[PDB]
Amino acid sequence: AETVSFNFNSFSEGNPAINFQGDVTVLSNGNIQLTNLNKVNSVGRVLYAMPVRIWSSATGNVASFLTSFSFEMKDIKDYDPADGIIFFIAPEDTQIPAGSIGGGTLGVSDTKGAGHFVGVEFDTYSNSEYNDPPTDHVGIDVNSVDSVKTVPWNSVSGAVVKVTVIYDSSTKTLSVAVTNDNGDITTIAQVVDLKAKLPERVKFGFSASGSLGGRQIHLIRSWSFTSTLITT
């Protein structure tokens, strides 16, 4: 089996295992801050530097993966707490969309909310233009921030959020378990054929964004990931 695994309990600038895109910044406490509180339409993305092969065109096999991470979003005075964070998977050539307006695109889609990626979003602002639910929510996105499915959620400022995601290649099921600060859990599942939506080689990462009036602190605190591809 072809396994890729890494664990980050903190991040440091210069680690070749991580690729920073946009307004990302590593705080002295080891945490990654995704957006710049002083920039308009700030977008910051952090990707695992090594491309992962999620499926083989030879065997036709798709990898299963288990990843968990924890983030934190804190409000700042006296800006709107937006827009949030998205854990995504994209082709290895993925770059912040040219002319990105940040905001509701979450740094992974164009103005229409379209892009090439699969991800789980933790949305804190309701963008009618992308058909967002009326409240905070977790959503499964497939090439669009107009989520294929969303579930009500509640982003608590300054609260640490723990997420666990399991992708089972046989059923092509992506299940997410989000553990809120209060102890309750929120789940959302969705069948997504990675082999049909993405190329053999992809990159995993987080992305966050803001707008002119929408800004907040987006922190990634830790990240563990493991993918295993059956090579026969």
Ligand X SMILES: OC[C@H]1O[C@@H](O[C@H]2[C@H](O)[C@@H](O)[C@H](O)O[C@@H]2CO)[C@H](O)[C@@H](O)[C@H]1O
Ligand Y SMILES: OC[C@H]1O[C@@H](O[C@H]2[C@H](O)[C@@H](O)[C@@H](O)O[C@@H]2CO)[C@H](O)[C@@H](O)[C@H]1O
Binding annotation for Ca(2+) = 123, 125, 127, 132
| Residue 51 in the binding site for ligand X (CB under 6 A) | no
Residue among 100, 121, 112, 89 at smallest CA distance from 43: 100
Site for ligand X in 111-130 (CB under 6 A): 125, 127
Question: Which residues, 6 or more positions from 29, have their beta carbon under 8 angstroms from its beta carbon?
Answer: 10
Quick one: which of 71, 161, 214, 220 contacts ligand Y (CB under 6 A)? 214
Q: Which phi and psi (to 5°) does residue 62 adopt?
A: -120, 140
Quick one: what does residue 72 bind among ligand X, a copy of itself, ligand Y, none, with the CB cut-off 5 to 8 Å set by partner type? a copy of itself
Min. distance of Cβ 109 from ligand Y in angstroms? Answer: 12
Closest to ligand Y by CB, 83 vs 200, is 83
Alpha-carbon distance 53 to 49, whole Å?
13
Reduce the DSSP state of residue 213 to 3 states and report it: coil
How far is it, in rounded angstroms, from Cα 16 to Cα 6?
Answer: 13
In the bound state with a copy of itself, the residue whose beta carbon lies nearer, of 5 and 135, is 5
The footprint of ligand Y on residues 9-28 (CB under 6 A) is none
60 binds a copy of itself (CB under 8 A): no
By CB under 6 A, the residues from 65 to 84 that bind ligand Y are 80, 82-83
| Closest separation in Å from C-beta 111 to ligand X | 10
Rounded alpha-carbon distances, angstroms, from residue 39 to 34, 42, 81: 12, 5, 14
Distances (CA, A) of 35 to 21, 79, 180, 231: 10, 14, 22, 39
Residues that bind Mn ion (CB under 5 A): 123, 132, 139
Which residues here bind ligand X, judged by CB under 6 A? 80, 82-83, 103-104, 125, 127, 211-214
